[PDB]
């Protein structure tokens, strides 16, 4: 087509779209000429870079700050060979429907920001190097669909351009950027609006489907205000994350030819484990950090302050961090009941400089007032929301309440928020960071000595700010778990307010994780797993969210039955006991075949090589958080696993699970819908009950 199909008859026009689904959207469209020959600079994707960017001084930063716009998307939209499009498709809030032209004015402001400072070169070089690396270190391709894709672009490109498709850029075109800046004008705009509220209002019907819309041209006073009246507000271009992206080299394995992470440094300040990548040899690194500190679970007020600290800390650093995250280094900050949770994942090239600035950043921390109020109110909503969630989460929350040492309820957390002031937190902050313990996982193609020097550097910076001193090795305590008095079957009830659903969790204390008990509990769990799939949903018809199985907490095993439904809880208990009878005789009716297919099922259930350094690193971290470190428990437990009999789990079954049982540790929790011994005070309940031991660290 030697001509665009939108020839000025339909420019500067709106549409009002009636959807079936209750969605609301805003659609800005620009038709633009062919730059397919201009694959050297690709300004349309450069505009897609600059529109959907979320960074310092960005448009969407203020649009969130104005609370009108959820998300946006923009960029070059292909059409025919001749014409191309430039679309912007935005989601709508309630009050987004009143400020439409304002929004568009801000878009214009952005265009004008590009019109003031003109084109940029270092942005093009930065995006050029980042897509050069992202093309170099691609991951995979589905064997079906790939071929249809590159065959889709096989028509348009010479045989050297079929793989370096758009993933490589030769030259710089400032005239094109001037051209598309001339294309981004209000003369060029095409508007469409989606809203359910367009009833009785759209007469002009679509030809094929039969939806209804309206031409409804924008008047000119709204138009003319955009062009000539142009000034700048709070918008500034985004900054760079260069950070020396050179060293992607793989490092060869040294004398430390361990297959599992070794503790390369232990002090009273920190504790450091290290593991070069043997199997994957990738140019990546993953880092996990625990900062242990006493002040975590001291009182509901300290917990709220820790929460808000990390929460607003995330809110502070997000605006700085997202453009570096855009470079291919993802992270997470979360909390523990014990301390803080730090994830650093990405390439090897610039994690030391980035993590350095992260520590320097979260060291020196400030508070805004209304920001504190919004986050405060927001978590306040999330807290008194907790009356209104799913009863399986309710059941797991009450189980982790009852079966730990100390536990602060969400009610206390609700009431205590009257006192969270800026000075009180601001007194709390240097006290917390003053004295703490570190624990870290370093895993990837890295060295031990540079890991020690960088880690040293980090904790030295920690001492540099607040004169950090290490913790004492007697206050690395953990909370123990309550020992049932060997016979008790206790129960109580909890009444939900919102959900007309009754959760229930049926806890069983087996034992600490010994090497026998892991395979006892896993194998017995699976032997009651698949016939439960046969009998519970189909035959007993309890509910749809019906779950059973292990419990891994504080180094203590457990057995559970998570069921949320709308039932009487004792009725539901009775059919659970019917399922217990079903599994009890289903033990004694086992053939050799059930046994053998089942243990092979467990085997393939357990056995798998890792598939990414983050997976194995997550399993190793998952072992460091339990402080067990049994790196080859896999092989031992499997080697043990084949050494079981039918009678091996019978003798496992009886003493804990039968009705005439001496070691029966049973306890349920009733969650009611909106309509043994009793437990009056859970403190006075937990008063005279013993505590379990801890695990000897190997």
């Amino acid at each position, epitope marked *: 087509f030697p001509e665009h199909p939108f020839q000025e008859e339909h420019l500067k026009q709106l549409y009002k779209i009636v959807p079936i689904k209750d969605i609301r959207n805003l659609y800005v469209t620009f038709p633009i000429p062919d730059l397919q020959k201009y694959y050297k600079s690709n300004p349309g994707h450069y505009l897609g870079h600059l529109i959907g960017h979320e960074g310092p001084g960005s448009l969407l930063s203020e649009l969130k700050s104005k609370g009108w716009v959820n998300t946006l998307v923009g960029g070059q939209k292909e059409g025919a060979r001749g014409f191309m499009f430039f679309i912007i498709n935005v989601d709508l809030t309630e009050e987004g429907l009143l*400020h439409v032209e304002d929004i568009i004015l801000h878009m214009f402001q952005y265009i004008q920001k590009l019109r003031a400072e003109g084109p940029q070169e270092w942005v093009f070089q930065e995006l050029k190097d980042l897509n050069a690396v992202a093309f170099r270190f691609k991951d995979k391709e589905r064997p079906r669909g790939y071929t249809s894709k590159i065959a889709g672009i096989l028509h348009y490109y010479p045989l050297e351009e079929v793989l370096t498709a758009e993933y490589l850029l030769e030259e710089f075109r400032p005239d094109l950027i001037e051209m598309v800046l001339d294309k981004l004008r209000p003369e060029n705009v095409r508007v469409a609006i989606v809203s359910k509220s367009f009833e009785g209002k759209t007469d002009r019907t679509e030809e094929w489907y039969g939806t209804q819309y309206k031409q409804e041209a924008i008047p000119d*006073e709204v138009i003319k205000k955009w062009q000539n009246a142009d000034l700048n507000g709070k918008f500034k271009l985004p900054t760079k994350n260069e950070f020396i992206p050179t060293n992607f080299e793989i490092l060869p394995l040294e004398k430390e030819a361990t297959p599992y992470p070794a503790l390369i440094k232990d002090t009273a300040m920190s504790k450091l484990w290290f593991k070069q990548d043997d199997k994957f040899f990738l140019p990546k690194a993953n880092l996990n950090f625990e900062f242990f500190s006493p002040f975590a679970y001291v009182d509901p007020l300290h917990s709220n302050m820790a929460y808000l600290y990390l929460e607003l800390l995330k809110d502070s650093l997000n605006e700085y961090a997202y453009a570096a995250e855009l470079a291919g280094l993802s992270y997470d900050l979360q909390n523990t009941i014990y301390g803080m949770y730090l994830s650093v994942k990405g390439y090897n090239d610039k994690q030391p400089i980035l993590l350095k600035k992260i520590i320097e950043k979260m060291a020196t921390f400030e508070i805004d007032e209304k920001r504190f109020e919004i986050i405060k109110e927001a978590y306040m909503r999330s807290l008194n929301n907790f009356r209104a969630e799913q009863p399986h989460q309710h059941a797991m929350y009450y189980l982790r309440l009852l079966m730990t040492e100390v536990a602060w309820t969400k009610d206390e957390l609700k009431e205590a928020l009257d006192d969270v002031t800026l000075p009180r937190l601001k007194a709390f902050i240097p006290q917390l960071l003053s004295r703490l313990h570190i624990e870290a996982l370093l895993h990837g193609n890295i060295t031990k000595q540079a890991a020690l020097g960088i880690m040293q550097m980090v904790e030295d910076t920690l001492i540099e700010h607040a004169h950090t001193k290490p913790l004492l090795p007697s206050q690395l305590v953990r909370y123990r778990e309550v020992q049932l008095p060997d016979r008790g079957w206790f129960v109580y009830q909890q009444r939900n307010e919102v959900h007309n659903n009754s959760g229930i969790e049926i806890y069983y204390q087996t034992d600490m994780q010994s090497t026998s008990e892991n395979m006892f509990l896993e194998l017995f769990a699976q032997i009651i797993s698949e016939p439960a799939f046969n009998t519970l949903r189909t035959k007993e018809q309890l509910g749809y969210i019906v779950f059973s199985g292990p419990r891994r907490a504080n180094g203590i095993q457990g057995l559970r039955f998570i069921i949320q439904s709308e039932k009487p809880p004792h009725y539901l208990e009775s059919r659970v006991e019917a399922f217990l009878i079903t599994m009890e005789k289903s033990i004694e009716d086992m053939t050799e075949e059930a046994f053998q297919k089942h243990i092979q099922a467990l085997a393939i259930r357990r056995l798998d090589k890792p598939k990414k350094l983050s997976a194995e690193s997550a399993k190793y971290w998952g072992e460091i958080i339990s402080q067990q470190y049994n790196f080859d428990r896999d092989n031992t437990e499997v080697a043990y696993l084949k050494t079981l009999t039918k009678e091996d789990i019978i003798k496992f079954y009886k003493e804990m699970l039968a009705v005439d049982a001496p070691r029966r540790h049973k306890v349920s929790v009733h969650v009611l819908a909106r309509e043994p011994e009793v437990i009056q005070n859970m403190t006075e309940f937990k008063r005279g009950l013993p505590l379990f031991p801890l695990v000897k660290p190997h």
Partner: antibody
Amino acid sequence: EVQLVESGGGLVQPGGSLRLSCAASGFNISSSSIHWVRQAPGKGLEWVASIYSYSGSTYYADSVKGRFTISADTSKNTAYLQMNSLRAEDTAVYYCARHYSAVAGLDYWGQGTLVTVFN
Amino acid sequence: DIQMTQSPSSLSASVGDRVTITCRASQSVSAVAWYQQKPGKAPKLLIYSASSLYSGVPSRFSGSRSGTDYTLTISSLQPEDFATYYCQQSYFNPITFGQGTKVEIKR
């Protein structure tokens, strides 16, 4: 060529909630659009509100944001303004007025009407 | 939200006098009107865009923009040109006015 017939503005007690008619004959509110203006007796002016009936775009002042609700019928080329939270400083004279194609050009007007929230 | 400094409150000059009235925005912006309204009557747009004359006004009126200084310029007064004035910045931002500029006579 321009006809701005605003009416319905009378006298009212606090706590009420009433509409605000304006008949914009001679042009379309889908074209260059109308505004509301707060002129108290013996005082200066103040732009109340503005609907864009082609897009439903409301815009309020800093003082009376939220408490007022403007609306627009394009089928009769006629806008309205529902009012809420009436206070004693609202004794004024209000005008419907056509803004035309200019940067600040609001040229035509109507006779106005007296809106009174009175002790 | 950018306010307006209406200067002066009022002034006095006779028929055939040169009257310059400076309103002043809170910020250095471009989008400013000028009005006239005799009491109990609808207003009139004297000067749109702070420099141009609206059609339907006698040609003894002009506007001028000087940076932030926004000036209504009256070349020659008339016996009917004694009325309340109003200057007006306009954006999508909420629109404020001045308190009124009254034109009185010299004697």
